[PDB]
């Protein structure tokens, strides 16, 4: 049914500018004030700004006042969030949000329609494909038990990378961890799988790593280390 | 600003049970209080507004109550679709959110299996060394990982990552990755990861000596 549709996110260098936009589907956006609410990786929700239906009143969170500017074009029916002098702490998913519904007896309106969010990544890093290193099953793996192995996907930018095992033939016991941002500004993740120790001599395990922003595609065989 | 405080941080529930979520405000917000559901990768969805009014399309098992600075979200007869993070928000004085309550699936304890991975020879050629500790399929979520290098406690040079709760056995898995320079890695012998978890009678240490098979 009714949706909000945003665009404009991406990777931007610290101190630079970026303009987001928001449009409505199934209703006229200019009939409503419009909010922006952001969510940084791993944390909660933070209100950013509000613009009156007619573009008169504009309001900003203290954290962005003087750096962000909100505007709207009620001919095209589009709301803009102009973000200047961006900093690492402005990295977040940015939601366009409608205050569309009010409780009985109230003139205060709750946020009933949220866009999908456009991602803003403030960073000085350049596109870089990962290195893929094996996480080799231990030589002391339990004889009649379970062994673990994996692939370390280190030093890439931007997100995401994907990982599969044996071209999709191995799915049970796989855990592909969310990436972490390293202090270098590059991401890193591991994908692991637990398998019968008895299979280590006979079954081949390959992790298929894809990092499409850098056109990097790697199949890495993981096996017990010879020593 | 008006500070919104939610409790507990995590609520562990079984389908069919009643979930009770608390939201406190640092000052009265009247009834201008909303509740949101959020699932990974998805935008928040409005559940309740005006403290007690259910939004259109929301099932009746969700209800809000309270007034002033004290509010409660009740999920009756919880269903598997309801495992999510729930935020409250006051919209009386600007717009501020609580930090969320995660409603997760309750189950019996499962101790992690623990594995340690030395840096690969291929990685050592590049100048850096990653040591990885894996905690596989455990419950509850609380887990402590401690790195020691020749009995020196490592602090600040590891990063952890945790999976979303498993849809099939409701467990968690976790990796901890210790980063050292190649030069530091080759200055030390004993690399050890100690895991504390309530399913383990005493902490489990997995370790290796650099150079041994």
């Amino acid at each position: 049914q009714v949706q909000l549709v945003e665009s404009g996110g991406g990777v931007v260098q610290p101190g630079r500018s970026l303009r987001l936009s928001c449009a409505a589907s199934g209703f006229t956006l200019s009939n409503y004030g419009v909010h922006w609410v952001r969510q940084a990786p791993g944390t909660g929700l933070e209100w950013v700004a509000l613009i009156w239906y007619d573009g008169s009143n504009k309001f900003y969170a203290d954290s962005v006042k003087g750096r962000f500017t909100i505007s709207r074009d009620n001919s095209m029916d589009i709301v803009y969030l102009q973000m200047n002098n961006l900093r690492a702490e402005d990295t977040a998913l940015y939601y366009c949000v409608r205050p569309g519904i009010a409780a009985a007896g109230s003139n205060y309106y709750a946020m009933d329609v949220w866009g999908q969010g456009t991602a803003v990544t403030v960073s000085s890093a350049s596109t870089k494909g990962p290195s893929v290193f094996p996480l080799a099953p231990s030589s002391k793996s339990t004889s009649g038990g379970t062994a673990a192995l994996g692939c370390l996907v280190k030093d890439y930018f931007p997100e995401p990378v994907t990982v599969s095992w044996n071209s999709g033939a191995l799915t049970s016991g796989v855990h592909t961890f969310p990436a972490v941002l390293q202090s270098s500004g590059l991401y890193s993740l591991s994908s692991v799988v637990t398998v019968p120790s008895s299979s280590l001599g006979t079954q081949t395990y390959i992790c298929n790593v894809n990092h499409k922003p850098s056109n990097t595609k790697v199949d890495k065989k993981v096996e017990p280390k010879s020593c | 600003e008006i500070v919104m405080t939610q409790s507990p941080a995590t609520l562990s529930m079984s389908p069919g049970e009643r979930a009770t979520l608390s939201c406190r405000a640092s000052q009265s917000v009247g009834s201008d209080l909303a509740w949101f559901q959020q699932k990974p990768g998805q935008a928040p969805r409005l559940l309740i507004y005006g403290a007690f009014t259910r939004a259109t399309g929301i099932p009746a098992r969700f209800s809000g109550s309270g007034s002033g600075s004290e509010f409660t979200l009740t999920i009756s007869s919880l269903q598997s679709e309801d495992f999510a993070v729930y935020y409250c928000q006051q919209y009386n004085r600007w717009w501020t959110f609580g930090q969320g309550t995660k409603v997760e699936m309750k189950r019996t304890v499962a101790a992690p299996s623990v594995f340690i991975f030395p840096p690969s020879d291929e990685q050592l050629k590049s100048g850096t060394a990653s040591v990885v500790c894996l905690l596989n399929n455990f419950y509850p979520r609380e887990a402590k990982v401690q790195w020691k290098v020749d009995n020196a406690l490592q602090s600040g040079n590891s990063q952890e990552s945790v999976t979303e709760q498993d849809s099939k056995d409701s467990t968690y898995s976790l990796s901890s990755t210790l980063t050292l320079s190649k030069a530091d890695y080759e200055k030390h012998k004993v690399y050890a990861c100690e895991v504390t978890h309530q399913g383990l009678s005493s902490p489990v240490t997995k370790s290796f000596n650099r150079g041994e098979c």
């Binding site: 509000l50 007619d54 009143n57 309001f59 205050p99 009010a102 | -």
Partner: peptide, 11 residues
């Protein structure tokens, strides 16, 4: 004075 929390929509 303006109440920033009041109805920002058309009416």
């Amino acid at each position: 004075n303006v109440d920033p929390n009041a109805n920002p929509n058309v009416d």
